[PDB]
């Protein structure tokens, strides 16, 4: 009946969820792989054997085991993104929000959430799919994927904990969407995978892996590229980090199989607890367990792939927002504090840049400084603050994205790039942080439609323009039905996406992105 | 009588020269050393044995042998600075312009002319001392010094052609000024040596050499520092260049004494002719025979001296003008032409920067480009033009000067720094060149007082403000009798010197001078 569909796995009973002045049918919690518990820890996802009877998809699923942030307890700003259902190793499920009436076959959008590859959840409130589904008539599915040690440990030649198992969890959720979205009214021939931060970086990874390209149509990447420094380690480094974690649990490190066993016997939180004492340096915006470029999955280095066009060739929509840096600076660079108007000193500035470009040599730090300091007022505390805010942002999201944009527009079927720079009116974070990495999401998912949560009317509107551009891109292959230009390697146009009449501009962070994407590398290459 | 003074060398008969509505006494051509002809070529200056009878100092002296510029014949812009009396190896003389009435004892200013150490003359019309002497009542002496191969050849251990003989010619003219200016009304206890380009760079050299410090009071350096890349070679390089020149004359290069002999037998123009085929690279703003840092004269590297305060400690007045680069670019960088509005291409730009930073490695050129290009419009022909104009200027005069300013203000008795940026109204050079290296001189020497040569009234005035600041500094030790701040290593003030109400500003070319004076060196040091 409307809330009871039959899929190749079995029947599933969903629910009606109100949305604005109406309803939608929601199927929360459909399983798609087997609970990777115990022995299966660190193994690739197995597909979920089909069921009898009707499965009750009316409750969001457990969240995955992950790091919970207690830096600013109760503060909604932090809590927003913390997991909200009990964490469980068993956590591989989907959530689908369909219209009522169930459409015949409509556009589908799959949201891969981000969170540095160490956290994240489907069930967050800011990832509530009902508003988008409802307003644009699309089906929306959110997926879960294993994050962290559990999702990205990577003892290379050991089939017991090869890398990227969490990446495959994404791919398996994509396949089930393919094979069964049809019974939900969706059109498998037009599914768009979207995602922010590590989700937007996972999205591009699937555009590059041979095996995933076929499972989706087009993609939308938000503040992420597969090539962002923090999203990938070499094989070696992944080994390196798993003996190091091996040591923080006092595991047997002889027989590699024993490493795997030892960890497979520790309880989840132990691993969560020592999860960060394994990184190799003092660094801000750098995470411990991430995708390894293993050869399988990613045939070869992403630079080669990018360089040769070896990747899916659809059109994409991607963008960056004004203050990417802030969050990391706040939570990790000395001098910054929520509550202060964090004017940095030149002392803490030079401390700051080291945390930001952790791999740079001294000469390299010199180059960075020279680029980001205002010599004409070399200690203006606030300028020092904002300058680090750009050093982290540029180096960690804007520049790697403009790289991917630039390489992929030579072989893809169209690129739409946005620059978001609106500060929501009801943000709880301090003004200095600006347009934080993460705050565009709430607009994309329609929370400014809910009156109860106090946004301003122009934000309601900005949220509608966005959701439209998004859904309209998700089918048409293009975002406008004024015209948002295509990005092109000549006069590289993009638009600002805010509450004022969109304006096309050209060459995003060009001067700085030359430094980061070309200069620095060549300098660190020499010496 | 007024035109016939008696000096420790003998008597000298000068002349009355009109100046404005009056006269002055002029003593042109007094000898101060022995004509360094033939056998004495390349030897140190001998002092001039005294004479009997009265010497007739009423005619300017011969000019020194040197390179004459025929790039734009007849064009006054070029011709201005070309030698105007027959060139002669015999060319060591002074010119003194005294008031009428002869003062008892007044301030003295000695003008050491510049010209890249390969050219220059006392007798130029733009170096006519009468207007300054007249208006400010100072005695003004101009000196000649041997330039070029003849002045700076440098077969290190050979007393027959040790280096810097031309530098010593300056010093000997300083001594005679010391010992005899008194009979001309000047006060030996208050002589200021001033000079532009290589003169302003020679001036600072004397502030550093042990032996010259005592011969003058204070100094004024215009577009020059002793430490400008082009003003000094190592001992080695000076050797290197003299065998190379040895070869262009097909000299015997075995016995070093034979090298010296061979050259001592070639006629002057042969040496002038091959004078440039000895430099070691393709470069703009770099000259062949220059001061060697030989240990004697300059005890040690100038960086040490600067670094330790080992130098005379008076107050100085120095400055730079807006478009230093232009002249060299015009005469030596591809794309530029008098007559064109020289918009450069990115092709000729990258050719340009190589000529400008001839010692840089590729990475280094990369660094320069990154700093001087507008990535947001990376091929705007005019921006490429002006950007090279700053690369040459900064690297060759502004930055080395701000270095010397900064080091010397920690131990000197006061520093007054100006930035000249007025375009004379009657300049003959094309507008693109702007405030050319060299054009402030005409203001300092009072040519805007002469109506016949068409300047505008505000320029007349600017010329008077200047001549005053200059003479007033030459006695007082300070330029103003509104107040032009002292330069200080904190809020490094300077003023613009132009036809509008002078404004103090701070930190001249600070962002760029960090790159050149600190960044680059460290990068070229690593690799
Ligand atoms: C990306 N979204 C917007 C979805 C969530 C980001 C939440 C704050 C991000 C910075 C904190 C990094 C913390 C790492 N530790 C706690 C280990 C310092
Ligand atoms: C400095 N002052 C203003 C006094 C005279 C400079 C005259 C033009 C300077 C640039 C030409 C360099 C030429 C070198 N060669 C001819 C060898 C290319």
From Swiss-Prot, chains A, B:
The keyword Cell division is annotated on this UniProt entry: no
GO biological process: one example: acetylcholine catabolic process in synaptic cleft
Tissue expression as described in the entry: Found in the synapses and to a lower extent in extrajunctional areas of muscle and nerve, and on erythrocyte membranes.
Active site positions: 197, 324, 437
Residues with attached carbohydrate: 56, 413, 454, 525
Enzyme Commission no: 3.1.1.7
Entry annotated with the keyword Disulfide bond: yes
Pfam families, alphabetized: COesterase
Post-translational modification: An interchain disulfide bond is present in what becomes position 593 of the T isoform.
Protein name: Acetylcholinesterase
Native source organism of the sequence: Tetronarce californica (Pacific electric ray)
Gene that this sequence comes from: ache
